[PDB]
């Protein structure tokens, strides 16, 4: 259905221990495709997906140049925010930035993002309207004033609606085997005694792409959201995702419980019983 491209930037000041550590990663949907680390030997933007490796030197030289610029902006940004917040020259701070675009099923522009956090709190964010800024505090109101003076929102909007979606579409085509795959989950169920008088049913979804999944337990078709053990969807580390949900079943109530699995890769949702 829908798709997204995201860039994530982390800059971390290490005062007295040289220049700040800057790390960048790019994703299409749940798939990493690029990285940059200020500390690594290459000083290159580097591929992390097979389907981007074949981009020629022009692509890589251009991404390297930009990521280096983004790195340098964050270096300055760490100084600015220090000033803004009247904070000690020594002390480690984190500047984070994310930007990217959503396309619908028709691969047309759906939403754009451009936002920052300082030390893990919201600093500034482009609003859904793609023209106004949310400024948390008075510090951000300074950024906001500057960006409003400079019509930053308009220039960004151009990227978000043009390049961002252009190159997302291009990547989805070039990575069609990986990026346009729906891998339905491999499911199974386990049963372990907890005591003389109650046992765990654990319902497993494995090896599925993308990460989006609905995994629920019903007792006589009534949902057990309050009584379900449900882990964070986690990466298997091969491009696929894992999840399970568990319920404690009192003795001889197994037949009352149904596991329901929903995923894009499933034509119709699974009901599983012990």
């Amino acid at each position: 259905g829908s798709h997204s491209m995201r860039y994530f930037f982390t800059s971390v000041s290490r005062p007295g221990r040289g220049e700040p550590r800057f790390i960048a990663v790019g994703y299409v949907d749940d798939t990493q495709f690029v990285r940059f680390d200020s500390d690594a030997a290459s000083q290159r933007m580097e591929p992390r997906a097979p389907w981007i490796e074949q981009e020629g030197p022009e692509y890589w030289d251009g991404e390297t140049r930009k990521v280096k610029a983004h790195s340098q902006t964050h270096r300055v940004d760490l100084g600015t925010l220090r000033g803004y917040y009247n904070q000690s020259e020594a002390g480690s701070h984190t500047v984070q930035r994310m930007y990217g675009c959503d396309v619908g099923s028709d691969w047309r522009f759906l939403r754009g993002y451009h936002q920052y956090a300082y030390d893990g709190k919201d600093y500034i964010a482009l609003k859904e309207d793609l023209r106004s800024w949310t400024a948390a505090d008075m510090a951000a109101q300074t950024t906001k004033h500057k960006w409003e003076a400079a019509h930053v929102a308009e220039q960004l909007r151009a990227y978000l609606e043009g390049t961002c979606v252009e190159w997302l579409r291009r990547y989805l085509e070039n990575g069609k085997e990986t990026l346009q795959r729906t891998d339905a989950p491999k499911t199974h169920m386990t049963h372990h005694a907890v005591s003389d008088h109650e046992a765990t049913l654990r319902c497993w979804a494995l090896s599925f792409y993308p990460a989006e999944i609905t995994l629920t337990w019903q007792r006589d078709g009534e949902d057990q959201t309050q009584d379900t053990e449900l882990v964070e969807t986690r990466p298997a580390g091969d491009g696929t995702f894992q999840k399970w949900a568990a319920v404690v079943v009192p003795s001889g109530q197994e037949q009352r419980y149904t596991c329901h699995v929903q995923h894009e890769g499933l034509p119709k949702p699974l009901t599983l019983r012990w």
Binding site: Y7, K66, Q72, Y123, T163
Partner: peptide
Amino acid sequence: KLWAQCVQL
């Protein structure tokens, strides 16, 4: 593709 503009807080 990264946004080619330099932007500072």
